[PDB]
Paper text:
However, these antibodies work by blocking binding between the human ACE2 cellular receptor and the receptor binding domain (RBD) of Spike (S), which is one of the most rapidly changing virus:host interfaces. The bicyclic peptides described here are structurally and chemically unique, comprising cyclized linear peptides with a symmetric, central small-molecule scaffold that forms covalent thioether bonds with three cysteines encoded in the linear peptide sequence. Rapid screening of diverse bacteriophage libraries against SARS-CoV-2 Spike yielded unique Bicycle binders across the entire protein. Amongst the different epitope groups, only E2 Bicycles were capable of directly competing for hACE2 binding (E2 IC50 of 520 nM).
Numbering used by the authors:
A (entry chain A): 333 to 527
B (entry chain B): 260 to 265, 273 to 279
Write the structure that this text describes.
């Protein structure tokens, strides 16, 4: 097959925690982007720097697929120019982003009775991430004047915190799986095309 | 729960 391995992207069994967002390089392949854009399963399919309709008529040097889980009400932060815990401390898109943000409700897989607390987000950081930066550090965050000595305590917080995905949560508090496609043009041959 | 309430990744519990 010449088909790009979007099967693996969209059908992966494990999705990353957003602070540790996964990147898959896509190269040397074809895809029918309209199979994705025409899907009734993607409640978000928002492109930047390119129209979704044009994708099958474009080629790129490489494509990258970033993926992770966040709350439905945080999907709005996965866009250029946004602020909030996710855009500021977990996954940041640049102003000049060329790509598409894709999301779907994953409550059936990612919530459990009694709550699924497996997925993490970074709640505290001394500064905002730069675009496409990834911070997987676990230093105790010093929120006051007293040093933390590597230990949780007053004003001394573990910087990663659990989402609490309960099946009966209001919809925006349910888990959504996100795939961000970024389309890379270099001064080099194209390797990823439409059909 | 993966941690006791207030500890670890359960600070907000
Ligand atoms: C079971 C549980 N786990 C976490 C991390 N937080 C709460 C409130 N409950």
């Amino acid at each position: 097959t010449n088909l790009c391995p979007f099967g693996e992207v969209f059908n992966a069994t494990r999705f990353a925690s957003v602070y540790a967002w996964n990147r898959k390089r896509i190269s040397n392949c074809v895809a029918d982007y309209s199979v994705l854009y025409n899907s009734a399963s993607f409640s978000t399919f928002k492109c930047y720097g390119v129209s979704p309709t044009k994708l099958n008529d474009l080629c790129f040097t490489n494509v990258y697929a970033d993926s992770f889980v966040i709350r439905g009400d945080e999907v709005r932060q996965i866009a250029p120019g946004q602020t909030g815990k996710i855009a500021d401390y977990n996954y940041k898109l640049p102003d000049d982003f060329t790509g598409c943000v894709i999301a779907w409700n994953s409550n059936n897989l990612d919530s459990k009775v009694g709550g699924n607390y497996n997925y993490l987000y970074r709640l505290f950081r001394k500064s905002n991430l730069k675009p496409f930066e990834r911070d997987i550090s676990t230093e105790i965050y010093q929120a006051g004047s007293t040093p933390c000595n590597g230990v949780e305590g007053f004003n001394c917080y573990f910087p990663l915190q659990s989402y609490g995905f309960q099946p009966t949560n209001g919809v925006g508090y349910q888990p959504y799986r996100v795939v961000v496609l970024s389309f890379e043009l270099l001064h080099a041959p194209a390797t990823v095309c439409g059909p | 729960c993966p941690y006791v309430a207030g500890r670890x990744t359960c600070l907000x519990c």
